[PDB]
Subunit: 30 residues, 3 copies
């Protein structure tokens, strides 16, 4: 259960970093 | 503590999937 | 490993709440 949590958290961090970049582009009009 | 982590990770995955859909709509102009 | 997971999940929750606010502003044209 801890290894499952670790993989899903790593996948969320990647997905969150992707969202942050996309939203910054939207906010800044890049 | 592991069960708390599991519930919060499941809630983050739902919230992240909601954000992904909303951002795709914004990016694609849907 | 559980404490590392806890800190990273807390950081994701903050980052996700920031994204939610920013996306709501984008969607509502605030």
């Amino acid at each position: 259960e801890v290894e499952a949590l670790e993989a899903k958290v790593e996948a969320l961090e990647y997905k969150v970093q992707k969202l942050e970049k996309k939203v910054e582009a939207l906010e800044h009009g890049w």
